[PDB]
Design an enzyme around this catalytic site. Sequence first.
Site, short mmCIF file in Angstrom:
data_model
loop_
_atom_site.label_atom_id
_atom_site.label_comp_id
_atom_site.label_asym_id
_atom_site.label_seq_id
_atom_site.Cartn_x
_atom_site.Cartn_y
_atom_site.Cartn_z
N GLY A 1 17.17 33.39 7.06
CA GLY A 1 16.71 34.70 7.47
C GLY A 1 16.90 34.93 8.96
N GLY A 2 16.13 35.88 9.48
CA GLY A 2 16.17 36.17 10.90
C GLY A 2 15.42 35.19 11.78
N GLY B 1 44.94 25.82 37.50
CA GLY B 1 43.60 26.36 37.57
C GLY B 1 42.54 25.40 37.08
N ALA B 2 42.94 24.39 36.31
CA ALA B 2 41.99 23.39 35.85
C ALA B 2 41.39 22.63 37.02
CB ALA B 2 42.66 22.44 34.87
#
Lengths: 131, 489, 244
Positions: free
Chosen positions: B150-151, B385-386
Amino acid sequence: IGRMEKALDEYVIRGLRHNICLLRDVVTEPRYRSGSITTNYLQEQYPNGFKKAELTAEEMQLMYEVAACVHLKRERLHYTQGTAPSERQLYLSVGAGQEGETPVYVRYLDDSHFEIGASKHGPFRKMEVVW
Amino acid sequence: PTAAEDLRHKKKRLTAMERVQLFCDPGTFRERDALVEHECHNFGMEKRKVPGDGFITGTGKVFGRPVFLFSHDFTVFGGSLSRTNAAKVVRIMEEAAKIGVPVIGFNDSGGARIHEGVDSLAGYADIFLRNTLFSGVIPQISVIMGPCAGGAVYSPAITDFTFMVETSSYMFVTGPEVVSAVGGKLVTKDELGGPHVHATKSGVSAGTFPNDIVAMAQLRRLYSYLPLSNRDPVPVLPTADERYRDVSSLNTVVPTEVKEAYDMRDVIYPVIDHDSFFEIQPQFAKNIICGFARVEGRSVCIIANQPKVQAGVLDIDSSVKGARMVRFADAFNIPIITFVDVPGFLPGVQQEYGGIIRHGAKLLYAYAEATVPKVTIITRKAYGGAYDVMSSKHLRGDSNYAWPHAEIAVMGAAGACKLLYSKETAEQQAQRIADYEKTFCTPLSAARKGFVDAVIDPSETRMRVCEDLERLARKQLQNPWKKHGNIPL
Amino acid sequence: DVSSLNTVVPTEVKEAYDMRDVIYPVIDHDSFFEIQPQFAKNIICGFARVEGRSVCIIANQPKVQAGVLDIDSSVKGARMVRFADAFNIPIITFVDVPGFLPGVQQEYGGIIRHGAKLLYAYAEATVPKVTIITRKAYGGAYDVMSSKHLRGDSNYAWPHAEIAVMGAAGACKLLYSKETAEQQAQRIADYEKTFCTPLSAARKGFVDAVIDPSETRMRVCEDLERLARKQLQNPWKKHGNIPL
Ligand SMILES: O=CCCCC[C@@H]1SC[C@@H]2NC(=O)N[C@@H]21
Ligand SMILES: O=CCCCC[C@@H]1SC[C@@H]2NC(=O)N[C@@H]21
């Protein structure tokens, strides 16, 4: 020989296997301590593969006692300041089915001294562990 | 006297009270509220009132330090929440917000209680708001011992860490009945939301345990690392280990060939204290490692690449994992230590079709926003960019170190040689790629520019890390005034 | 060990007892400093130590005038609470009140103003509070004497307590206007049995737990040790406007 026995156990090797178990079992065998051996000794005493010899009752009891002492010593490290315990009652059992539940006590009277006994209100032995 | 719990144990399952007893100290649990009823008066519920009302909330005490907890009860009404169940949880969280204490909850609810109507939704909303407001103030840990549908699934999600039990637990938003109704596929509950699925596929669960007993035993160990609140300092424990212990095995870990792989744990383990690693999410995105560890008796955060799996290449899942870990570590003033070995980002259409641009920016945002002391060690390589993302010196890094065989370049030698000579005479490969790699694929240029503090022998890493982490104990840095950031979701 | 508290409260509801017999066991030995001992004797205020730290004590006394709140008692308690909170001193209260003192002189003297001072002092306070309900708490007196709804930290009750809107007679009168005569015998007893007990207040969630009277020292020490670092703040004001 005793020296070798003792010196085998203090050789810490980590990262790969070895044959120290075979050397230990061969040295501890009463046939080897009898005095004389042969060249066909190994396969004569190891017919099917290799199987290390087991432990007697007192050795397993001592291992239990040392394990309990180590558990308590490492437990006391995590507690903060003086809010730490000094006595427990543990239930040691090797194997996935709890074979031979052995109640154990511990008291930690000093930094490297305990008062191992069967349980509460049982006679104590005061062994020593340094780890 | 072992009444009314024989029915539970017969199904090879434990009870909420037994779990609470196992977690805390032997005799330091004080149950807060115990005589509360649902007062529903609908659908034939005016009868069968229950004293506890399906919840056990108390205070407890772990390792001499206070805690707060609550546990669902499966026997009573299936563990459903109500207007009345949620009140106790709200009171506990509010009290743990006034005092600097964390909260740990053992979820077992079968869903909402239909007989209360929208009051269950009201309770869920209140719990969600408390979780949202108090996240980043007090650490929140959640463990799922049984069904959770459920929620109600959302409140564990907002919590910092979620753990799962192997045999008898699952979690999902919608049941398989609705899936069969709409799509027409028959999937079991375990096939849908089992612990393995969330351990490997969705990345929600932070770990899995084989038994409840082991779960408690290791949850205590995890709790021993955390700080008590937002304003409290990082805990420091006594330890016989010392910074002068010899580590010369690090001189040989890195192979002399550039195409052979190695295990980064062989570098991680010597630096930290013995038997003090607690890996987080061990089975998800294995190309990156995150967890907690101690250095000279103080807890730190570990984030390192692994060339064993997929050549240690950054990805979507790795980015999310590292970003969450960095954000949590910084929120509570925990030092960060990183080991860098990355050839770049994973190339593929699926990656762009899945939004690599959004996800890869999360790790960079987390590293740049952080203000805790940082230590970075570049073992072998860092390209493109790593190199920028993995805590480079320009992102307000404190101290950066490199090993003598490292490489820091814009890209691989082949691409640079191609772009630097468009139609240069053929066979240019042999006499240009070797020269370029020799001249610029080495830490000498990056050291000349000033991007690494010093080039060190691999045997001095423990000494340097302990020295720097001891000196940096009292850094005070502050970001410009904001209501809050805007992270790329 | 404090087991003498199990017998302090008499089993009759119309007999009186001395609240000091409850105050003294909980605090440390020979550590009470009464404030204003000869004025408004129906309420006790002073300083005391619990496990080596100074706390503030405010308790009713059924010995004098059935432990009924009044003008003078309200002023005394209000001043004590305000001073204690101003300097971050924990407050411990013991509750036993049947209501307010009825009389024309009281209204001609302004009970409405004075009784509000104690409520203001209790609500404005931000120090840790501990409350113990020994026997009874009725009407607005229950609200005033540090009820759980006024941001109280922990509240406890004893197994023979009573928390109701008013006495059984008035409730029975208002709930049955012209019901058949002799209604007294078979209605007042039933109403007191069903609703003059801490079970209903515990069901609503107004008391944390119902405890044995022998555990009061343990509970108080535990709570006062845990609450050592509470940080609560009121909305921004130049200052309040207390009913003078
Ligand atoms: O030379 C052709 C393929 C080179 C790929 C090198 C690795 S693979 C993933 C990452 N992306 C790159 O551009 N380089 C690295
Ligand atoms: O039953 C008639 C008189 C009951 C008075 C009970 C005590 S006296 C003062 C206080 N005010 C009340 O209404 N009840 C209590």
